[PDB]
Amino acid sequence: TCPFYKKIPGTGFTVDAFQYGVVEGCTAYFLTHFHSDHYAGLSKHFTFPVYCSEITGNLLKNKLHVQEQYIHPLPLDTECIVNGVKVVLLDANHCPGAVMILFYLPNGTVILHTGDFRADPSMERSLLADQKVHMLYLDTTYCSPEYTFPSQQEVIRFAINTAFEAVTLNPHALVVCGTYSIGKEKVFLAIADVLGSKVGMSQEKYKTLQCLNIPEINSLITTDMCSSLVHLLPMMQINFKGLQSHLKKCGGKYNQILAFRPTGWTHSNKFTRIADVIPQTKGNISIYGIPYSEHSSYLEMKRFVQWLKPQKIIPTVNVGTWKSRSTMEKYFREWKLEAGY
Ligand code: NI
């Protein structure tokens, strides 16, 4: 059964609610983004209207085979009327196609649902600038001050400089990057660009990237592994065994692997600065864990909320324990007393 923090009061609408069968009273299901915890339930058999971005819609049609008659893509930054209710989709700065959704309720209440997001000051100059939000349904993934990590741009600078140095010292090195969902594509795209290569991958992953409206993509990626010196592998293969196994398949072209494992936050962010990060190494294989986050840091989150000044906050992540719920409520009250709303 559908939980309350996925329901939008006073509408026939749910958000990211596809795993509960038919939801009593729902005339339109919104999908914020193509991650499995959020789409869980969609297939070729779905016969209700799905409202989403153009990129999410491409992924539903090609990867999950949802029939085209039930896909309703909406443009971003544009007032749209759905079942007699004004809505707007906003870029969430998460993975490709991910949105926030602003709902203008018939009773005058305004609701923002962030989906999954990485708060940014640029959001302060979207269509949110105008106005009051009575209810914020907030991605609280990292809602505690211990959760610190660098900018995406700093992490990508470290990855480019690390890969360009290694391959200039050894032209016979291969670079390997792990993936398991959409998002974080800048990590392998920026590496391949500095090295003058296309990115090599499986047929399945190529098909997924072809859905994402990335400009000039045909110039950047390939299924011909032999032609590429940056390879993508599933994340589960990014270990000494799985990397050794890969190196054998490459026909003695290469005598070293440098591999990247993009993660979210890890506890080594408490101690070690991005500049100071070192790899795990066995023989001719080296693995770097890099904290490339597509969710708000605590500080980013706090800034966004203190700017927006919502009347009420409903968390959508870490809601399962009394201690988690309590911690988050303590922070929402501090932020409100500090800023005066
Ligand atoms: Ni997500």
Side-chain angles (χ1 to χ4, degrees), residues 302 305-306 309-311 313 329-341:
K302 178 178 181 282
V305 174
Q306 291 182 308
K309 308 187 165 42
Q311 282 192 356
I313 301 171
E329 296 195 359
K330 278 173 40 259
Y331 289 120
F332 305 151
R333 181 66 60 173
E334 290 184 8
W335 298 350
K336 179 179 163 77
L337 285 166
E338 178 181 33
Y341 54 100

mmCIF file of all heavy atoms in Angstrom, residues 302 305-306 309-313 329-341, unseen atoms left out:
data_model
loop_
_atom_site.group_PDB
_atom_site.id
_atom_site.type_symbol
_atom_site.label_atom_id
_atom_site.label_comp_id
_atom_site.label_asym_id
_atom_site.label_seq_id
_atom_site.Cartn_x
_atom_site.Cartn_y
_atom_site.Cartn_z
ATOM 1 N N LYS A 302 20.650 22.693 3.364
ATOM 2 C CA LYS A 302 20.284 23.760 4.309
ATOM 3 C C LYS A 302 20.128 25.162 3.620
ATOM 4 O O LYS A 302 19.154 25.876 3.900
ATOM 5 C CB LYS A 302 21.364 23.841 5.386
ATOM 6 C CG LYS A 302 21.193 24.922 6.458
ATOM 7 C CD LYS A 302 22.263 24.868 7.472
ATOM 8 C CE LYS A 302 22.108 25.914 8.557
ATOM 9 N NZ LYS A 302 22.540 27.218 8.118
ATOM 10 N N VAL A 305 16.744 25.134 1.500
ATOM 11 C CA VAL A 305 15.572 25.247 2.350
ATOM 12 C C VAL A 305 15.421 26.617 3.058
ATOM 13 O O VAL A 305 14.304 27.173 3.124
ATOM 14 C CB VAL A 305 15.491 24.042 3.368
ATOM 15 C CG1 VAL A 305 14.327 24.217 4.377
ATOM 16 C CG2 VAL A 305 15.474 22.710 2.654
ATOM 17 N N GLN A 306 16.506 27.131 3.586
ATOM 18 C CA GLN A 306 16.478 28.484 4.222
ATOM 19 C C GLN A 306 16.181 29.585 3.244
ATOM 20 O O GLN A 306 15.539 30.561 3.665
ATOM 21 C CB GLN A 306 17.772 28.812 4.966
ATOM 22 C CG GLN A 306 17.965 27.960 6.231
ATOM 23 C CD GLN A 306 19.225 28.310 7.004
ATOM 24 O OE1 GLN A 306 20.335 28.367 6.476
ATOM 25 N NE2 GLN A 306 19.059 28.554 8.304
ATOM 26 N N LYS A 309 12.091 28.872 2.328
ATOM 27 C CA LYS A 309 11.227 29.119 3.508
ATOM 28 C C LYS A 309 9.854 28.446 3.420
ATOM 29 O O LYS A 309 8.762 29.103 3.553
ATOM 30 C CB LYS A 309 11.070 30.667 3.690
ATOM 31 C CG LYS A 309 12.374 31.444 3.729
ATOM 32 C CD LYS A 309 12.178 32.932 4.082
ATOM 33 C CE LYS A 309 13.490 33.638 4.480
ATOM 34 N NZ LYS A 309 14.695 33.331 3.660
ATOM 35 N N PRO A 310 9.811 27.109 3.278
ATOM 36 C CA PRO A 310 8.563 26.389 3.157
ATOM 37 C C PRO A 310 7.832 26.471 4.535
ATOM 38 O O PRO A 310 8.463 26.444 5.618
ATOM 39 C CB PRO A 310 9.052 24.959 2.843
ATOM 40 C CG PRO A 310 10.298 24.884 3.552
ATOM 41 C CD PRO A 310 10.965 26.185 3.272
ATOM 42 N N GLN A 311 6.525 26.353 4.488
ATOM 43 C CA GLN A 311 5.749 26.346 5.726
ATOM 44 C C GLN A 311 5.835 25.036 6.507
ATOM 45 O O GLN A 311 5.852 25.045 7.725
ATOM 46 C CB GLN A 311 4.300 26.742 5.455
ATOM 47 C CG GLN A 311 4.082 28.231 5.261
ATOM 48 C CD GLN A 311 2.585 28.593 5.293
ATOM 49 O OE1 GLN A 311 1.718 27.739 5.394
ATOM 50 N NE2 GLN A 311 2.310 29.860 5.211
ATOM 51 N N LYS A 312 5.938 23.924 5.778
ATOM 52 C CA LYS A 312 6.046 22.552 6.342
ATOM 53 C C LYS A 312 6.990 21.759 5.440
ATOM 54 O O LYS A 312 6.879 21.871 4.230
ATOM 55 C CB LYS A 312 4.721 21.867 6.376
ATOM 56 C CG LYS A 312 4.742 20.488 7.011
ATOM 57 C CD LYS A 312 3.489 19.765 6.643
ATOM 58 N N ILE A 313 7.784 20.848 6.049
ATOM 59 C CA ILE A 313 8.710 19.951 5.351
ATOM 60 C C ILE A 313 8.268 18.502 5.688
ATOM 61 O O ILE A 313 8.087 18.178 6.869
ATOM 62 C CB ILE A 313 10.178 20.197 5.781
ATOM 63 C CG1 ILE A 313 10.594 21.659 5.484
ATOM 64 C CG2 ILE A 313 11.055 19.184 5.040
ATOM 65 C CD1 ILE A 313 11.898 22.028 6.045
ATOM 66 N N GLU A 329 13.933 16.293 12.051
ATOM 67 C CA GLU A 329 13.081 17.356 12.605
ATOM 68 C C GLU A 329 13.850 18.397 13.444
ATOM 69 O O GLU A 329 13.548 19.609 13.374
ATOM 70 C CB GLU A 329 11.928 16.768 13.422
ATOM 71 C CG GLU A 329 10.933 15.931 12.609
ATOM 72 C CD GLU A 329 9.632 15.660 13.351
ATOM 73 O OE1 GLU A 329 9.536 16.115 14.516
ATOM 74 O OE2 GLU A 329 8.701 15.006 12.783
ATOM 75 N N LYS A 330 14.867 17.959 14.185
ATOM 76 C CA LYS A 330 15.729 18.854 14.946
ATOM 77 C C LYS A 330 16.419 19.828 14.027
ATOM 78 O O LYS A 330 16.455 21.054 14.248
ATOM 79 C CB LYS A 330 16.692 18.156 15.874
ATOM 80 C CG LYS A 330 16.023 17.775 17.204
ATOM 81 C CD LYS A 330 16.815 16.920 18.182
ATOM 82 C CE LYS A 330 18.257 17.307 18.272
ATOM 83 N NZ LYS A 330 19.061 16.346 17.464
ATOM 84 N N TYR A 331 16.945 19.331 12.897
ATOM 85 C CA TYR A 331 17.626 20.222 11.925
ATOM 86 C C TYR A 331 16.628 21.182 11.273
ATOM 87 O O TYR A 331 16.962 22.405 11.126
ATOM 88 C CB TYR A 331 18.484 19.403 10.917
ATOM 89 C CG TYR A 331 19.664 18.836 11.534
ATOM 90 C CD1 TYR A 331 19.890 17.457 11.572
ATOM 91 C CD2 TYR A 331 20.614 19.662 12.139
ATOM 92 C CE1 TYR A 331 21.069 16.946 12.202
ATOM 93 C CE2 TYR A 331 21.713 19.177 12.763
ATOM 94 C CZ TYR A 331 21.911 17.830 12.895
ATOM 95 O OH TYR A 331 23.041 17.367 13.562
ATOM 96 N N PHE A 332 15.450 20.782 10.894
ATOM 97 C CA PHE A 332 14.462 21.671 10.237
ATOM 98 C C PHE A 332 14.088 22.789 11.229
ATOM 99 O O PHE A 332 14.058 23.958 10.790
ATOM 100 C CB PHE A 332 13.167 20.940 9.796
ATOM 101 C CG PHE A 332 13.364 19.752 8.901
ATOM 102 C CD1 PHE A 332 12.417 18.726 8.950
ATOM 103 C CD2 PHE A 332 14.439 19.681 8.006
ATOM 104 C CE1 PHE A 332 12.625 17.566 8.191
ATOM 105 C CE2 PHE A 332 14.542 18.564 7.145
ATOM 106 C CZ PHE A 332 13.701 17.516 7.270
ATOM 107 N N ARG A 333 13.987 22.486 12.502
ATOM 108 C CA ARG A 333 13.689 23.578 13.520
ATOM 109 C C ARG A 333 14.880 24.528 13.720
ATOM 110 O O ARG A 333 14.675 25.748 13.782
ATOM 111 C CB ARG A 333 13.171 22.962 14.831
ATOM 112 C CG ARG A 333 12.805 23.982 15.921
ATOM 113 C CD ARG A 333 11.630 24.873 15.573
ATOM 114 N NE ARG A 333 10.437 24.041 15.349
ATOM 115 C CZ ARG A 333 9.188 24.472 15.143
ATOM 116 N NH1 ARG A 333 8.872 25.775 15.170
ATOM 117 N NH2 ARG A 333 8.226 23.560 14.957
ATOM 118 N N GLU A 334 16.116 24.032 13.764
ATOM 119 C CA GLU A 334 17.281 24.906 13.842
ATOM 120 C C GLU A 334 17.237 25.849 12.634
ATOM 121 O O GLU A 334 17.340 27.056 12.769
ATOM 122 C CB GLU A 334 18.630 24.138 13.873
ATOM 123 C CG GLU A 334 18.912 23.362 15.150
ATOM 124 C CD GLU A 334 20.254 22.710 15.197
ATOM 125 O OE1 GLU A 334 21.053 22.966 14.293
ATOM 126 O OE2 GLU A 334 20.492 21.852 16.060
ATOM 127 N N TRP A 335 17.081 25.280 11.435
ATOM 128 C CA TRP A 335 17.167 26.135 10.207
ATOM 129 C C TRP A 335 16.128 27.247 10.250
ATOM 130 O O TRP A 335 16.463 28.386 9.841
ATOM 131 C CB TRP A 335 16.958 25.264 8.955
ATOM 132 C CG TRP A 335 17.996 24.145 8.731
ATOM 133 C CD1 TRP A 335 19.145 23.934 9.364
ATOM 134 C CD2 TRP A 335 17.864 23.113 7.743
ATOM 135 N NE1 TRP A 335 19.769 22.776 8.922
ATOM 136 C CE2 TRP A 335 18.968 22.268 7.895
ATOM 137 C CE3 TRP A 335 16.831 22.766 6.793
ATOM 138 C CZ2 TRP A 335 19.133 21.157 7.076
ATOM 139 C CZ3 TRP A 335 17.044 21.677 5.989
ATOM 140 C CH2 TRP A 335 18.170 20.838 6.195
ATOM 141 N N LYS A 336 14.934 26.936 10.675
ATOM 142 C CA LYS A 336 13.817 27.904 10.759
ATOM 143 C C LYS A 336 14.120 28.979 11.823
ATOM 144 O O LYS A 336 13.896 30.188 11.520
ATOM 145 C CB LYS A 336 12.557 27.202 11.087
ATOM 146 C CG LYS A 336 11.242 27.978 11.260
ATOM 147 C CD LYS A 336 10.178 26.923 11.571
ATOM 148 C CE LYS A 336 8.907 27.465 12.175
ATOM 149 N NZ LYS A 336 8.095 28.094 11.126
ATOM 150 N N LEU A 337 14.634 28.617 12.993
ATOM 151 C CA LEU A 337 14.957 29.616 14.068
ATOM 152 C C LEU A 337 16.108 30.492 13.615
ATOM 153 O O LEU A 337 16.066 31.725 13.822
ATOM 154 C CB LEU A 337 15.336 28.912 15.395
ATOM 155 C CG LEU A 337 14.115 28.348 16.079
ATOM 156 C CD1 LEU A 337 14.483 27.376 17.190
ATOM 157 C CD2 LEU A 337 13.284 29.486 16.715
ATOM 158 N N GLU A 338 17.124 29.945 12.933
ATOM 159 C CA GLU A 338 18.234 30.703 12.475
ATOM 160 C C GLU A 338 17.875 31.764 11.457
ATOM 161 O O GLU A 338 18.405 32.879 11.514
ATOM 162 C CB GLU A 338 19.401 29.823 11.896
ATOM 163 C CG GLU A 338 20.571 30.625 11.361
ATOM 164 C CD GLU A 338 21.711 29.803 10.771
ATOM 165 O OE1 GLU A 338 21.417 28.754 10.206
ATOM 166 O OE2 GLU A 338 22.892 30.244 10.850
ATOM 167 N N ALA A 339 17.073 31.381 10.484
ATOM 168 C CA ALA A 339 16.684 32.257 9.358
ATOM 169 C C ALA A 339 15.429 33.096 9.636
ATOM 170 O O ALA A 339 15.128 33.990 8.845
ATOM 171 C CB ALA A 339 16.440 31.388 8.160
ATOM 172 N N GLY A 340 14.638 32.771 10.655
ATOM 173 C CA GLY A 340 13.451 33.614 11.029
ATOM 174 C C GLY A 340 12.104 33.386 10.358
ATOM 175 O O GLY A 340 11.208 34.198 10.527
ATOM 176 N N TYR A 341 11.909 32.282 9.633
ATOM 177 C CA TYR A 341 10.632 32.002 8.990
ATOM 178 C C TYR A 341 9.737 31.167 9.913
ATOM 179 O O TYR A 341 9.999 31.055 11.110
ATOM 180 C CB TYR A 341 10.762 31.361 7.555
ATOM 181 C CG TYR A 341 11.608 30.109 7.420
ATOM 182 C CD1 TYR A 341 11.051 28.823 7.365
ATOM 183 C CD2 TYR A 341 13.020 30.223 7.304
ATOM 184 C CE1 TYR A 341 11.871 27.682 7.193
ATOM 185 C CE2 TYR A 341 13.806 29.061 7.167
ATOM 186 C CZ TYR A 341 13.182 27.824 7.140
ATOM 187 O OH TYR A 341 14.049 26.735 7.037
#
